Amino acid sequence: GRMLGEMWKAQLNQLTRQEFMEYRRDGIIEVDRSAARKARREGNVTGGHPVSRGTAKLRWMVERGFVKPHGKVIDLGCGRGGWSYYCATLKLVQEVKGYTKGGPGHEEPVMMQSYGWNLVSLKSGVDVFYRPSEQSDTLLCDIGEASPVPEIEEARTVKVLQMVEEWLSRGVEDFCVKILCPYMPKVLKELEKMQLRWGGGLIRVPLSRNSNHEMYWVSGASGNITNSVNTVSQMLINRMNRTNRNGPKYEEDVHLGSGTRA
Ligand SMILES: C[C@@]1(F)[C@H](O)[C@@H](COP(=O)(O)OP(=O)(O)OP(=O)(O)O)O[C@H]1n1cnc2c(=O)[nH]c(N)nc21
Ligand SMILES: Nc1ncnc2c1ncn2[C@@H]1O[C@H](CSCC[C@H](N)C(=O)O)[C@@H](O)[C@H]1O
């Protein structure tokens, strides 16, 4: 038998494009980024606007205690830097190192002056899958590229977990790791072993789009992995089958201020 999430992916792939676009943001929470997009086009780096939607997703988890960034934070796949700049605003964070691939088709780090920007060092041109691990107090990873083929998303997710395993073995106190495809067998098998060793649990951020099944493995959660994943699959399938669509529920984006930290 298959996990319900496999069903969801098959049904997702059968939507027309118009159906898909009507579904992907139906009933999710979305922060309004109109001012942020104007800020990046105007080079406004002091207005507190996050560089991406990712900031609001990590804020959601941090304010619920699912991860408590502190000390030295390493941000794997930092992209423009939304997670890294957010952590540098936090009282217990002392240093943020972000690594991302960059180059054609990939986001380059953006230089911002949000609060605590001077604690952030972002490095492009870095393939984290071949980078030696380093010590960290907080380990973040937001990597996982979508595909219509669930076996490709499965393999991509397993590769992330095998990399994270090396970084966690350095001794990490807090973590938050994107699980792109949590319902496929090879991901479940690996995650269950890694939960046994390192703890944590899977959570679904309601800012995630209905067009993906992404969940985050976070140190400040617990709970059965199979049940957590199934709960998300049923929600996403329920939303796909309720065809009176409303678009997202809008909320306010994070304000990251400006200024250096001592
Ligand atoms: C093919 C996919 F399965 C993608 O593998 C997944 C994520 O496609 P996506 O790039 O939007 O990812 P998403 O936006 O959710 O994630 P974030 O940006 O928040 O990180 O949706 C499906 N998909 C994309 N386009 C279409 C489409 O035209 N028609 C249909 N039927 N399915 C589509
Ligand atoms: N092998 C790899 N090594 C390093 N970065 C990678 C990678 N594969 C993908 N990435 C990067 O992972 C990034 C995920 S971006 C995630 C959003 C980010 N947390 C924010 O808040 O802005 C992408 O920019 C992508 O280019």
Domain boundaries, the chain: 4-30+53-245
* CA 184 – ligand 2 centroid, Å: 22
3-state secondary structure of 260: coil
Give the residue carrying structure tokens 């106190």. Answer: 173
| Both structure tokens of 46 | 């002091």
Residue nearest to atom 22 of ligand 2 (CA): 82
Strand partners, 179: 215
Q: Class assignment of domain 4-30+53-245?
A: alpha beta
* CA 153 – ligand 1 centroid, Å: 12
Distance between CA atoms of residues 245 and 142, nearest Å? 29
* CA 132 – ligand 1 centroid, Å: 32
Distance between CA atoms of residues 50 and 80, nearest Å? 10
Length of the chain: 262
Q: Which atom of ligand 2 is nearest to the CA of 131?
A: 3
3-state secondary structure of 226: helix
59 CB under 6 A from ligand 2? no
Residue nearest to atom 11 of ligand 2 (CA): 77
Distance between CA atoms of residues 174 and 214, nearest Å? 19
Q: State CA 179 to chain mean position distance.
A: 8
Strand partners, 29: 249
148 CB under 6 A from ligand 1? yes
Residue nearest to atom 13 of ligand 2 (CA): 77
- Residue 209 region by backbone torsions, left for phi larger than 0, else alpha for psi between -120 and 50, else beta: beta
Give the residue carrying structure tokens 């319900």. Answer: 4
Q: Which of 62, 100, 145, 178 best tests ligand 2's pocket when mutated (most atoms within 8 Å of CB)?
A: 100
The H or E element containing residue 67 is: none
Main-chain phi, psi angles of 71, to 5 degrees: 65, -135
Selection from 29, 22, 34, 19 nearest residue 248 by Cα: 29
Q: CB of 59 within 8 A of CB of 253?
A: no
> What is the DSSP pairing of strand 138-141 with strand 174-179?
parallel
User: Within 81-168, where are the H helices?
Assistant: 82-88, 150-168
| CA atoms 236, 237, 239, 245: torsion sign | positive
Q: CB of 100 within 8 A of CB of 68?
A: no
17 CB under 6 A from ligand 1? yes
Q: How many helices (H) and strands (E) does the chain have?
A: 8, 9
> What is the DSSP pairing of strand 29-32 with strand 71-76?
unpaired
Main-chain phi, psi angles of 100, to 5 degrees: -150, 160
* CA 42 – ligand 2 centroid, Å: 24
Other C-beta atoms lying within 10 Å of the C-beta of residue 141: 25
Name residue 147's amino acid. Answer: S
Distance between CA atoms of residues 69 and 175, nearest Å? 8
| Both structure tokens of 122 | 């972002």
